[PDB]
Amino acid sequence: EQELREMAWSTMKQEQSTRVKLLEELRWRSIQYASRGERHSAYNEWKKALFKPADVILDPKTANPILLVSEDQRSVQRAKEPQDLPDNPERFNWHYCVLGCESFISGRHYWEVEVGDRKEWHIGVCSKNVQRKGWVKMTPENGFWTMGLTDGNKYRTLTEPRTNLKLPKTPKKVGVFLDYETGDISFYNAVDGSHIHTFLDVSFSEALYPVFRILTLEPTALTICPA
Amino acid sequence: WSTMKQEQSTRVKLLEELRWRSIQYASRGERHSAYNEWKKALFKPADVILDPKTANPILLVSEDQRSVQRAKEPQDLPDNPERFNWHYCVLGCESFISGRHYWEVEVGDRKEWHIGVCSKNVQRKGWVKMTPENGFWTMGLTDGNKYRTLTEPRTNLKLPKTPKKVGVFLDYETGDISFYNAVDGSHIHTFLDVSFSEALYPVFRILTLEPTALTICPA
Amino acid sequence: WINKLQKEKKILSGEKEFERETREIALKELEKERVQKEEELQVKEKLQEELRWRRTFLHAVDVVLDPDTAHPDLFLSEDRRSVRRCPFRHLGESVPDNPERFDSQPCVLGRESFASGKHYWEVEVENVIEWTVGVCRDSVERKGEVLLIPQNGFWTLEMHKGQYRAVSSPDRILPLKESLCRVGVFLDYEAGDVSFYNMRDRSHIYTCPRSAFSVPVRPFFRLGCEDSPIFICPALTGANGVTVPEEGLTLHR
Amino acid sequence: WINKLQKEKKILSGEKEFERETREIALKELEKERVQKEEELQVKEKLQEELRWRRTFLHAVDVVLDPDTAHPDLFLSEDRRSVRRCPFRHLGESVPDNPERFDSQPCVLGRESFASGKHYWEVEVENVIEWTVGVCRDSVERKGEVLLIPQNGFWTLEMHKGQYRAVSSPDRILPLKESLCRVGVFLDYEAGDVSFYNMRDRSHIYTCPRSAFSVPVRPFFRLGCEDSPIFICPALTGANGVTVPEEGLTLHRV
Numbered sequence A: 001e002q003e004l005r006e007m008a009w010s011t012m013k014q015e016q017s018t019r020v021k022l023l024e025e026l027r028w029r030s031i032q033y034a035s036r037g038e039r040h041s042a043y044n045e046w047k048k049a050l051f052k053p054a055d056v057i058l059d060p061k062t063a064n065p066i067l068l069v070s071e072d073q074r075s076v077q078r079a080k081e082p083q084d085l086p087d088n089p090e091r092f093n094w095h096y097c098v099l100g101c102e103s104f105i106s107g108r109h110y111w112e113v114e115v116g117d118r119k120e121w122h123i124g125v126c127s128k129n130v131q132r133k134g135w136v137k138m139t140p141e142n143g144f145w146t147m148g149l150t151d152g153n154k155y156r157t158l159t160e161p162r163t164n165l166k167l168p169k170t171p172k173k174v175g176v177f178l179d180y181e182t183g184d185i186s187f188y189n190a191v192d193g194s195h196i197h198t199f200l201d202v203s204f205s206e207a208l209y210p211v212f213r214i215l216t217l218e219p220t221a222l223t224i225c226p227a
Numbered sequence B: 001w002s003t004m005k006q007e008q009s010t011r012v013k014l015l016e017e018l019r020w021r022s023i024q025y026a027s028r029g030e031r032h033s034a035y036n037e038w039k040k041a042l043f044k045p046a047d048v049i050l051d052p053k054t055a056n057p058i059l060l061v062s063e064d065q066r067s068v069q070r071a072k073e074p075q076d077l078p079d080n081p082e083r084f085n086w087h088y089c090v091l092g093c094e095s096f097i098s099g100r101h102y103w104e105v106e107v108g109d110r111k112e113w114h115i116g117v118c119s120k121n122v123q124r125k126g127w128v129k130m131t132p133e134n135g136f137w138t139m140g141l142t143d144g145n146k147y148r149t150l151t152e153p154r155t156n157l158k159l160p161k162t163p164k165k166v167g168v169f170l171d172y173e174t175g176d177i178s179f180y181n182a183v184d185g186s187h188i189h190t191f192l193d194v195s196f197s198e199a200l201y202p203v204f205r206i207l208t209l210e211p212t213a214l215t216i217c218p219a
Numbered sequence C: 001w002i003n004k005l006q007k008e009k010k011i012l013s014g015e016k017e018f019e020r021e022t023r024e025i026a027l028k029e030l031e032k033e034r035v036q037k038e039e040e041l042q043v044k045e046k047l048q049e050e051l052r053w054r055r056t057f058l059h060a061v062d063v064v065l066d067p068d069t070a071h072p073d074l075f076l077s078e079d080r081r082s083v084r085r086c087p088f089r090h091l092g093e094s095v096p097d098n099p100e101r102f103d104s105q106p107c108v109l110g111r112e113s114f115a116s117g118k119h120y121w122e123v124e125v126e127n128v129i130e131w132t133v134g135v136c137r138d139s140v141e142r143k144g145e146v147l148l149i150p151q152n153g154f155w156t157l158e159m160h161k162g163q164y165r166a167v168s169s170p171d172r173i174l175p176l177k178e179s180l181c182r183v184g185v186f187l188d189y190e191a192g193d194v195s196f197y198n199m200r201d202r203s204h205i206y207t208c209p210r211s212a213f214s215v216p217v218r219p220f221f222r223l224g225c226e227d228s229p230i231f232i233c234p235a236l237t238g239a240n241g242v243t244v245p246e247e248g249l250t251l252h253r
Numbered sequence D: 001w002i003n004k005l006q007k008e009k010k011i012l013s014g015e016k017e018f019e020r021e022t023r024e025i026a027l028k029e030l031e032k033e034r035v036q037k038e039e040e041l042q043v044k045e046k047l048q049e050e051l052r053w054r055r056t057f058l059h060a061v062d063v064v065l066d067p068d069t070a071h072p073d074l075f076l077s078e079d080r081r082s083v084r085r086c087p088f089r090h091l092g093e094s095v096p097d098n099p100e101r102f103d104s105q106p107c108v109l110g111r112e113s114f115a116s117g118k119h120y121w122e123v124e125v126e127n128v129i130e131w132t133v134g135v136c137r138d139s140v141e142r143k144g145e146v147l148l149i150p151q152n153g154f155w156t157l158e159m160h161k162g163q164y165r166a167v168s169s170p171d172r173i174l175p176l177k178e179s180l181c182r183v184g185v186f187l188d189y190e191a192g193d194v195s196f197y198n199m200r201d202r203s204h205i206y207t208c209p210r211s212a213f214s215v216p217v218r219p220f221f222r223l224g225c226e227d228s229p230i231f232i233c234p235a236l237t238g239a240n241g242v243t244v245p246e247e248g249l250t251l252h253r254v
Ligand SMILES: C[C@H](CO)CCOP(=O)(O)OP(=O)(O)O
Pocket: B086, B087, B088, B089, B129, B130, B142, B150, B154, B205, B206, B207, C210, D240, D241, D242, D243, D244, D245
């Protein structure tokens, strides 16, 4: 009796044909909804509804020796000299980046990171099969999708080559929103609800990790606040 | 039991998901460009043939059912529940009940017109206010150069340009109707959240006489 | 048996003829009913056509009031076509008031009720200090005091303390050059049109915001002065009711 | 013998039941048509009542004039409610030889034809010095000069040499103490009434003696040697064909 297997064989084709057309139609809805835009109450309206609040805890085991993960496991500080500690393949050795213990395999999630009055930071989403040893350019082709501040009042998106993001305001709290299926990583100003950058049509194959890197010595810690 | 249950729950959830996507997806920039990139793929064209039988006796319609123009004097033509007797209104032949359609009206350089959709059961005998409550979802230009939407109360609309062409898009399932500036692809107005009841009909009215009528572009 | 069956055939074959006559009396009634219905339909649409022809006409209405439905303070001419407000002529007199009479509003209602068509009536309000004229629904309040507004069913033009105003929202004072000699109230039922016209020149003065009545509408007048003649102009009566000498009736009063 | 005969009996019973079942449909149709005729009788009675409430009412006609019957010396405005004179304006010009043309006196006929009921209209003649206004039979002679009298089918009021005048019987001097600006013409077909009124105060001027018409009557206007145009006051149109705001419409002008 193949009818029991026939039902699965039928639902597999109907499910494969459903999501492709749904995603194409959704992208055309995106390009159409581009007009008639405002955000006065949007951020607190749908960031708590459509995006499944997710908490990110910092993982000391991947942090560089120069980075001091705070005792609360949520904040990261910049220290003076690299303290000695074992070199696991997870651990970075050149790039100053730290990740979270959990990877979001699929779905839609978000997390809020407050940068405060910092002068150098880079937060974003990295892959799992990234090159953690040596130096590798943090481009989308290398698995990094990151927003960053540089030399005081410069804003950049780490594509290749670096592109400048001219913005009117100065963010203090940035919400990162990841949609696996739609393939969209979005950075929003959590204080007011504006828009900074969204990565469109990202071919996702592996799991995704939060990534935070800090270069300059600063007395301000990068805090990840949960839901 | 699950057959109609799916068609209820999953489609309702998809509708609410798209409604919530409207807010967060318009929170981005207003990159209103390539008006032909979405107006042909998301929405399918509709060739609007006018119905030279539901029109007011005052209106002249060309043999090709493109132009409607207010004639000099009212005519005395046979009447029936199809014919509007007071409102200077003309309807297309076809009705829309599902899917999503659109049509372009070339208003030219006129001084007064109104376009939109109306319910199947509209009151064609006497005067009835043209509001969303009755079934007339319409908008257009009055007082020479004043743009307005026929709500309760009627609402003035601030436009940064002058729309020589207006594109009306209907999407029955979402239940939202939109008027766009087809000249440059900008967005003029949009009635949201509307829950339709029966089939919808194109409508046109002009309370004035001008050398240029209301031309209707093909599908 | 065989005998039972032959009698059965004899009786049951004896049922066809009754069915035949029932069929016949059904069909004949059907056909003459069809033709009679056709004749009725033909005359009905003849009447339809005649009415459609005779429904685009403006009718000069000869308004006659009802002295029962006026304030007891008011005074009405015996001809019932002109009214005023006398200084309490019923001081010491008892006037039983019917349920359909105003009590605190010094108004009077035209007894004729319109339900379609275009109508209009003129009013001569020379030398008055407070006059309001217009249209009211047949279902307006009577027991107490209300406001003359389009919501309550009162399309009115008012002259208050020397200022000419619309439906009596004090926020719409019109730019009117001079006083009104003769004011015409025009009414279009199938369009919600209540217009006030300057009859010195037949010039547009005001149009009330459109509001479907759905109930018969009647003329309505209110006065505030004391003994200030207001005159409802009667429709042109022609020379009916008076013998015309062959010389030709001239300058009739 | 029994077998085939009882086949026949069963067959006959076969159509007896269908004949029986064909009766209720016919009876139900007849009763439903009874209901339909009752409803149509009710609608017909309502129509008759409404048409009885009809033309006992005075009808204010919106007079539009007929260019085809206008004299070549006469000129019509764009709205067909204004007529003036201009000598030598259609001398040899392209004008058809319409048999319904006034080509003797400077006159023009209203487009409306009246057959019954009371109907009246108003004319602005303040700017002229020689005006004739009234009613005419539809069969008045047109080619040659005629006499504007009831004998020929004319009921008119006239201005001649600064003096008001009757049907042009010069024995009927009109002692009007004030100069006219607006004149009202009133017609009553049943009682043969042709009245003239002074529209400033709506007072009687002259009623022509009763004479049964029996012919569709029509308004008739005649403009003397005065280039000032004659205006026929349009009926009270109201706010028709205009957009009404929510704060009302004040002082409409067109
Ligand atoms: C003559 C026009 C077209 O029929 C009708 C005017 O109706 P209004 O209600 O006064 O116009 P609007 O609703 O647009 O304000």
